[PDB]
């Protein structure tokens, strides 16, 4: 609560009580330890899931995979000590992400054994077998998508952020679709306002009756955005939100723009994506009447590597919408090539 | 950008860049030194408005009273040069504060003769002229309340490099009623949230579901709370709102508490008010079926020093809904004396 601050451009400075936020997106996943409950108890969890028929697990965000990659071999050591044929295999995430129809159970008993998992004197080793409890990846063959659990954890404490960095995670006890609010944050002040989380950053400006200003995205989360941590949750139409509700887009009049509708068919295959209202280099957009229709998003650069110049749209307002990632530049759904409606361009597949 | 951010809960140092919310109500007096924009125009505006039959001005917050008292007689000194037969007086604030039907205009031209902006005007204090102008105070007998403006000043900018912030204020060009938002602010984090203003502090916590925890009050305004700076604006019963909608209350599901309804007969006559969910000193409350119905609030201490040791209410959640003020301790409307008629008790002023 107690802290200090220096204004971005003004000379105002002070050290007083209050509540503060900072961005935690570009820090790139600070090296936290992630105690997922006591590993001794967690060993009894996956046993029931496999016994009941759960074969794979999907990821919800690029944080659970890191925890799994951190703990890894120690899990196999527990079952080796107790004598159960099973193991884990970890892949990499690709976007967009997809939800799962299953949730993990909660064991009522501890595994009878001398726990040598956490705090032991090193010596963690194991081998590979055929009983793969695959988590993440494209290994649909061992476990199809409809058999994978999703978002079956819960935060318990976010302390020790200085030196020990041991955010406590534990399996949730009840079913729900909402995200975990323990880390979500949002605030507003005067002429500026923004909503932020561990993987999103959206800026809204008070220029004229609120309008999207700029946003930063690193992972296409599809969790259910909570309504109790958002502003102005009534009086909006789902057809105008830039980020559709399926993509965890905040429900707020701030989360919209004039002259544009939802972007459910956008280029959601990139890795990290930033939303900017500006014409891409060389390319330009003209607001005309004889343009086409609301087609799937088209890449700004031809497969040969050269850029496409002329585009058109009807409801646009300067500046045009744009998506920017490492792959290059993409334009909005409403923006189509002007003179030639030919589909000889890189195109994104249907998403919904 | 950077902040001290010493977390008292877990003694954590924490750095970054983001948005900052500060609690500034506790030290309102020394943070401000207002002034109009080119008082040469303000004098002309006040002179022109008086010609239309407007008698005085009723303040909206103690800040405007401080500004008017600071400028005080300086207006007469500048008015004298042009031979204006009008005099302006400054009064004092009282709890609560009512609205003003009228509004001020904006001049089309400035004074014809006189080119003074700031300077030596500190060395003049004149007597009454043939006409008088009044502002706030105990002047109910000069002109009726229906002949004064209210909430007509905007906040062009806030904060400057003096620590007596040279906030520029001027008359609104349009017609509006909502409270000035340029100074308002709110934020949410984890399991805490608060809506902040120059004279308002409201705290909310998540035990079970969002509700009220504590609040601090210095003055009662009567301007509509801006909705676009509120959390969870979905439909809610106006009755449950602890802070009445009329007293510039927030429209949020946080601003509520199950088992209690609107408090329109609270001790708003008190100079300073704080809302805490703790019983009055030495008293006690119970929830009983056969207690009295809703009615005017009763002070826990009699004017003769006698205290009331019995209280009850039906739909209340135990034990308090308490008010704290310089003059003593009160109770909410729902609570009634168990075995004492209200005739022999200090009834709260009914400003509903």
């Amino acid at each position: 609560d107690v802290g200090c601050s220096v204004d971005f451009s003004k000379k105002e400075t002070r050290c007083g009580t209050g509540v503060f936020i900072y961005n935690d997106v570009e820090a790139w996943r600070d090296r936290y330890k992630y105690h997922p409950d006591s590993p001794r108890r967690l060993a009894a969890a996956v046993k029931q899931a496999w016994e009941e028929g759960i074969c794979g697990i999907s990821s919800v965000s690029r944080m659970e995979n890191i925890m799994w990659k951190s703990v890894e071999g120690e899990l196999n050591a527990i079952l080796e000590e107790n004598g159960v044929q099973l193991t884990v295999v970890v892949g990499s995430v690709k976007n967009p992400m997809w939800r799962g129809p299953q949730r993990l159970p909660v064991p009522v008993n501890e595994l009878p054994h001398g726990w040598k998992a956490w705090g032991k004197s090193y010596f963690v080793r194991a081998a590979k077998t055929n009983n793969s409890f695959v988590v993440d990846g494209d290994t649909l063959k061992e476990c199809p998508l409809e058999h994978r659990a999703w978002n079956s954890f819960l935060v318990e404490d976010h302390g020790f952020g200085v030196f020990h960095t041991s955010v406590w995670l534990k399996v949730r006890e009840d079913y729900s679709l909402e995200c975990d609010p323990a880390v979500i944050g949002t605030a507003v002040k005067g002429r500026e306002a923004a909503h932020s989380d561990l993987g999103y950053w959206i800026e809204s400006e008070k220029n004229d009756t609120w309008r999207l200003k700029r946003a930063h995205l690193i992972e296409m989360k599809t969790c259910e955005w909570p309504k109790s941590h958002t502003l102005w949750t009534d009086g909006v139409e789902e057809s105008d939100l830039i980020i559709p509700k399926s993509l965890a887009g905040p429900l707020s009049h701030h989360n919209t723009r004039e002259g544009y509708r939802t972007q459910v068919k956008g280029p959601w295959h990139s890795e990290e994506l930033e939303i900017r209202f500006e014409e891409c280099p060389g390319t330009k957009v003209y607001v005309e009447e004889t343009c086409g229709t609301r087609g799937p998003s088209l890449r700004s650069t031809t497969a040969s590597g050269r850029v496409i110049e002329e585009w058109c749209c009807r409801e646009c307002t300067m500046p045009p919408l744009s998506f920017r990632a490492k792959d290059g530049c993409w334009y909005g759904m409403e923006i189509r090539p002007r003179k030639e409606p030919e589909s000889n361009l890189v195109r994104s597949m249907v998403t919904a | 950008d950077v902040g001290c951010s010493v977390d008292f809960s877990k003694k954590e140092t924490r750095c970054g860049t983001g948005v900052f919310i500060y609690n500034d109500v506790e030290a309102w007096r020394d943070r401000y030194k207002y002034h109009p924009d080119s008082p040469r125009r303000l004098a002309a505006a006040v002179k022109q408005a008086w010609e239309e039959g407007i008698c005085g001005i009723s303040s909206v917050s103690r800040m405007e009273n401080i500004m008017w008292k600071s400028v005080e007689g300086e207006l007469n000194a500048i008015l004298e040069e042009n031979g204006v037969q009008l005099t302006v007086v400054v009064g004092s604030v009282k709890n609560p504060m009512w609205r003003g039907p009228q509004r001020l205009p904006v001049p089309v031209n400035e004074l014809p003769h006189g080119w003074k902006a700031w300077g030596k005007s500190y060395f003049v204090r004149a007597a009454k002229t043939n006409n008088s102008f009044v502002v706030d105070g105990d002047t109910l007998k000069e002109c009726p309340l229906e002949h004064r403006a209210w909430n007509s000043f905007l906040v062009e900018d806030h904060g400057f490099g003096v620590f007596h912030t040279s906030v520029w204020l001027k008359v609104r060009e349009d017609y509006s009623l909502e409270c000035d938002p340029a100074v308002i602010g709110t934020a949410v984090k984890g399991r805490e949230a608060a809506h902040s203003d120059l004279g308002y502090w409201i705290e909310s916590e998540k035990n079970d579901t969002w509700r009220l925890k504590r609040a601090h009050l210095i003055e009662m305004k009567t301007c509509e709370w801006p909705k676009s700076h509120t959390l969870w604006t979905d439909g809610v019963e106006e009755s449950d709102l602890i802070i009445p909608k009329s007293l510039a209350g927030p429209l949020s599901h946080h601003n509520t508490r199950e088992g209690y309804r609107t408090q329109v007969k609270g001790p708003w006559h008190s100079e300073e008010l704080e809302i805490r969910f703790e019983e009055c000193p030495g008293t006690k409350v119970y929830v009983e079926e056969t207690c009295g119905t809703r009615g005017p609030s009763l002070r826990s201490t009699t004017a003769s020093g006698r205290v009331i040791e019995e209280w009850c209410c039906r739909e209340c959640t135990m034990p308090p809904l308490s008010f704290r003020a310089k003059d003593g301790c009160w109770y909410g409307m729902e609570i009634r004396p168990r075995k004492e008629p209200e005739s022999n008790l200090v009834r709260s002023m009914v400003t509903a």
Partner: nanobody
Framework: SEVQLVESGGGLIQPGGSLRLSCAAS????????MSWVRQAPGKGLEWVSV???????YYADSVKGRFTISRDNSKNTLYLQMSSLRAEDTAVYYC??????????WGQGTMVTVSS
């Protein structure tokens, strides 16, 4: 106690009236799980009225847009729904449903609501 759902409060009212219906619970806690009202038109398929999250968020269907309201009680583990501006076409059988697609559902007996002029 066992797990049951009980309805009560059905009756008859003229057009434009309002009524209150309740959905009691036994054994489990209504606060923890999800709830939703389902109505059956006479000799037609089922229809979905509204839903309430355990976190305290609600959504209403287009048919009852701006006419219904649902609230829950924590002291006695009970659920309530309010209806305003009734009409003849609304006549149907109503009952709260545990629409949880993870473990199973319990459906109440239900009661009829009649609108006659």
């Amino acid at each position: 106690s066992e797990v049951q759902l009980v309805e009560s409060g059905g009756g008859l009212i003229q057009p434009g009236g309002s009524l209150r219906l309740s959905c009691a619970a036994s054994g489990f806690t209504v606060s923890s799980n999800y709830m939703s009202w389902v109505r059956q038109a006479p000799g037609k398929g089922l229809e979905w009225v509204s839903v309430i999250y355990s976190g305290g968020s609600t959504y209403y269907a287009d048919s009852v847009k701006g006419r219904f309201t649902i609230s829950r009680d924590n002291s006695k583990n009970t659920l309530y729904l309010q209806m305003s501006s009734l009409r003849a076409e609304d006549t149907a059988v109503y009952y709260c449903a545990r629409l949880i697609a993870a473990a199973g559902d319990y459906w109440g007996q239900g009661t009829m609501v009649t609108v006659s002029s």
